[PDB]
Every structure is written in structure tokens, then in C-alpha cells.
Amino acid sequence: AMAATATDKIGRSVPAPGKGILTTAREHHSSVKYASPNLNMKYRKRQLVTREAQIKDWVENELEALKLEAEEIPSEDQNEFLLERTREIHNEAESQLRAAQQQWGNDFYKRDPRIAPLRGALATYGLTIDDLGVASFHGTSTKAN
């Protein structure tokens, strides 16, 4: 789900462990009266269904325009124009559906300072912070660690 790395603060001790990985739980709490709808998966899915309709429309209008460019091509070698240029509209339709999935499904929380990296990671599968079952401690048998 998540994988991060952090340093710590100003020190003079290279073996001293620090708190710098706390930043995986960094979020803003100034404005925590009403629930952000970016966490509700129903909302997020509604926005994707909308944007999928727009991409469906987008493909029609580029297949209308690819018909109106195939006519000017001599009909002997317009087969190899259509093969090349329907494949290009397949790609651009795929990219846009992925990019929309990336925006509402995977990376909904990357530009929201009210969602911690740790919380967002787990929210992408409908898990809450209360489902992180087990913590596998470095646990070196040192005093400081």
C-alpha cells in the first residue's frame, strides 16, 4: 500500500534513532468539523462514472474526425492509415481511463493535506486506520531503539 523513508533532525550521533518517520501520519486537523467527501468511496466512484461517460464521448468525436481525414487519403492505402490511427485512439482512450482511475481510485489523497499518507494508503481498499492489525517492530533489543 505504502513505502516511505525519513531522516531525523540536527544531531551529532549517527547511530541514534529518531522520530522522522512520524511524517507518514502527517495530516491537518484545523478544520475537522465535517467529513471530507474525498474519503467516501461512493463519492469517488460517482466522479469516475461521470468522467468515463466524457471519455466514451471523446472517442466518438475522434472516430468521426478520423472518418473525415480517411476520405482525402486515396482509398488504395487508407487501410494502413486507419490501422495506425485507430490504435492511436485506443491508447489515448486507455490513458484517459487509467488517469481518471489514478485520480479517484489510487491518488485521491496525494494533494489533500487532511489525509495522511498512512490513512490514504488504507482508504484505497475501504480499510480504516482501525484495521492495521499488526506492527512488525525493528525491535533490535537495544535500549534506545
Binding site: 472516430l63 485507430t86 485506443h90
Partner: protein, 144 residues
């Protein structure tokens, strides 16, 4: 590698409407993205599909790609007729696509969709379908 099976069918379906077959006939291009079809949902599938298209699509390898192939043909026919609405909402059960295994797909149209077609001057309605993991494109022509 580059030019796969889906690009041959889509290139051939918009090479059959580049001013050769489309002399005197209203045309209908519709794409539907595979993802937007919800198979488990039984309200959408019962009201907009016949028992002949549910029996066919359910038995295919890619059930969601085959429902999106058929659903695109029903929105390609519905545009190719010219008609704007068939009374209230969209019940496209009436426009049936009889897809024979290894055979060109046939359009046999019943109910209120049959009336507004024969009234508009429509004898035969062709349709072509290419479907894969992403897009499901459907071209239809309707001649007198």
C-alpha cells in the same frame, strides 16, 4: 505486435462508412467502455437485454466485454434510425442483436422501435461490433 486483432476490426468498420456504403443512409457510431457495464446488477441487464442476448453474452469468455459489444450495437442502431426518443426512458430490449457463433450479427427490431423505423423508411439495418478489454465500438447503417 503493434496491430492486434481489435485494431483490424475497428479499422475495417470505419472503412465501411468512408463514403462507399453510406450513399443514402443514416449512420450510427457508438463506443461504450467495458468498465461502465455492471453484470452483477440485474435491473440494467433484465430491462435493456432480451433472454436471447443474456443466454449468449453470459456463455462467452469475457462476459463484460460481450455485454458492452451488444449494448454499443443497440446505441448504434438507435442513432442510425435518426429517431430522438421511443417514449419516456431508454428501454433498448426492443432492439435485439441475434449474435450467431462464427456469423455476422443480425438486427431484428420489435415493439415501438419497429413502428418508428418502418414509418421513417427503413427496410434493413446492418451492424458491426468489435470488443476487447477497454472499448466496444459499434457502427450501424439504416437504408430504405
Amino acid at each position: 505486435s503493434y496491430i492486434n486483432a481489435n485494431t483490424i476490426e475497428t479499422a475495417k468498420m470505419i472503412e465501411n462508412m468512408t463514403k462507399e456504403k453510406v450513399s443514402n443512409g443514416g449512420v450510427g457510431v457508438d463506443v461504450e467502455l467495458i468498465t461502465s457495464i455492471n453484470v452483477e446488477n440485474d435491473t440494467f441487464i433484465e430491462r435493456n437485454f432480451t433472454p436471447q442476448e443474456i443466454e449468449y453474452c453470459s456463455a462467452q469468455p469475457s462476459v463484460q466485454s460481450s455485454f458492452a459489444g451488444t449494448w454499443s450495437a443497440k446505441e448504434a442502431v438507435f442513432k442510425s434510425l435518426g429517431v430522438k426518443s421511443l417514449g419516456g426512458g431508454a428501454a433498448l430490449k426492443d432492439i435485439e442483436i441475434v449474435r450467431v457463433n462464427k456469423n455476422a450479427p443480425a438486427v431484428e427490431l420489435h415493439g415501438n422501435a419497429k413502428k418508428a423505423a418502418e414509418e421513417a423508411g427503413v427496410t434493413d439495418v446492418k451492424v458491426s461490433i468489435s470488443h476487447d478489454d477497454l472499448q466496444a465500438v459499434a457502427v450501424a447503417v439504416s437504408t430504405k
